[PDB]
Amino acid sequence: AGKKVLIVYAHQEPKSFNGSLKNVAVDELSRQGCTVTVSDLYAMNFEPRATDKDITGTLSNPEVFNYGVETHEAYKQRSLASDITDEQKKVREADLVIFQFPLYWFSVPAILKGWMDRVLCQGFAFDIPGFYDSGLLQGKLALLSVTTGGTAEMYTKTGVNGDSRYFLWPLQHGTLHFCGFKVLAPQISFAPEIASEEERKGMVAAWSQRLQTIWKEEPIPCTAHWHFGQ
């Protein structure tokens, strides 16, 4: 209600189920009085590739290009490409970052993987040392709102695809927790293409419903046990 939210959205079609989930999030968070910003990656033609065009100043080592080293320096020097710094400003100001996307190969679509690769650079999102619980984005919350082609049953320990929490590991732990985020439970909307119109409406309303009390939620314990068990 007195918070800022950044929604990083990755779907090509406004009329899609992902489009609906993104829109209801904007509607509900706005109704609450929150400040809301959406980075619609495909509409922005967001650059996913990590290249030397991401640094505009003199390279530290112009003979052997190392993306991590050069972007870390460029961040400190303020010589990163502006599309990257534009996103960093949104993240810096946000209290909560919601990622809205369809699962592609049990991960994020490449345009969103590119956002992770390029925006969460050393110096901004983490440092060495300064990761996991000491990540630079500590104090901020993050939530993955994903949609799948597979059904919930397929995403179980005994299902063909295994438990859904397994594929969340690189994203929730390896990325968000690594950067210091407290991770809220994922919103997983299963197989909307298969579901009925009513079921679809039900999944949208369940997300809107959850958002009504999102600020009262506790984050998940982002650990190997939560993700894998035993």
Under the rule (CB under 8 A), what is the footprint of its own copies? 12-13, 15-16, 42, 45, 48-52, 63-68, 104-111, 113-114, 116-118, 120, 132, 149, 157, 160-163, 166-167, 169-171, 173-175, 193, 224, 227-228
Residue 180 binds: one of Zn ion, ligand FAD, its own copies, none (C-beta under 5 to 8 A by kind) = none
Burial class (CB in 10 A: 0-12, 13-18, 19+), 141: buried
Q: Which residues within the stretch 194-213 sit at the binding site for ligand FAD (CB under 6 A)?
A: 197, 200-201, 204
Minimum CB distance to ligand FAD, residue 134 (Å) = 17
Q: Which residues of 177-187 are buried (b: 16+ CB within 10 A; e: fewer)?
A: bbbbbbbbebb
Minimum CB distance to its own copies, residue 20 (Å) = 12
5: Cα within 13 Å, side-chain hemisphere: 24
Minimum CB distance to Zn ion, residue 169 (Å) = 8
User: Rounded CA gap, 10 and 18, in Å?
Assistant: 8
Return the residue of 51, 193, 209, 217 that touches ligand FAD, per CB under 6 A. Answer: 193
Instruction: Tell me which residue has its CB nearest to ligand FAD.
Output: 149
Determine whether the annotation assigns residue 42 to a binding site: no
Determine whether the annotation assigns residue 18 to a binding site: yes
Task: Give the SS3 label for residue 182.
Answer: strand
68 binds ligand FAD (CB under 6 A): yes
Strands 4-9, 96-102: parallel, antiparallel or unpaired by DSSP?
A: parallel
Determine whether the annotation assigns residue 178 to a binding site: no
Residue 222 binds: one of its own copies, ligand ML1, Zn ion, none (C-beta under 5 to 8 A by kind) = Zn ion
Other Cβ atoms closer than 10 A to 133 = 11
Q: Which residues within the stretch 97-126 sit at the binding site for ligand FAD (CB under 6 A)?
A: 102-106, 117
Query: Which tokens sit at 65?
Result: 């290009």
Minimum CB distance to its own copies, residue 49 (Å) = 5
Residues lying near ligand ML1 in the complex (CB under 6 A) are found at 68, 71-72, 105, 121-122, 128, 149-151, 174, 178, 191
Residues lying near Zn ion in the complex (CB under 5 A) are found at 173, 177, 222
Query: CB-wise, 154 or 220, nearer to ligand FAD?
Result: 154
Angle between helices 110-119 and 82-93 (to 10 degrees): 80
Determine whether the annotation assigns residue 23 to a binding site: no
Given a contact cutoff of 8 angstroms between Cβ atoms, the answer to whether 187 and 148 are in contact is no
If you count DSSP H runs as helices and E runs as strands, how many of each does the chain have, helices first? Answer: 7, 6
- Rounded to a whole number of angstroms, the distance between the first and last alpha carbons of the chain is 38
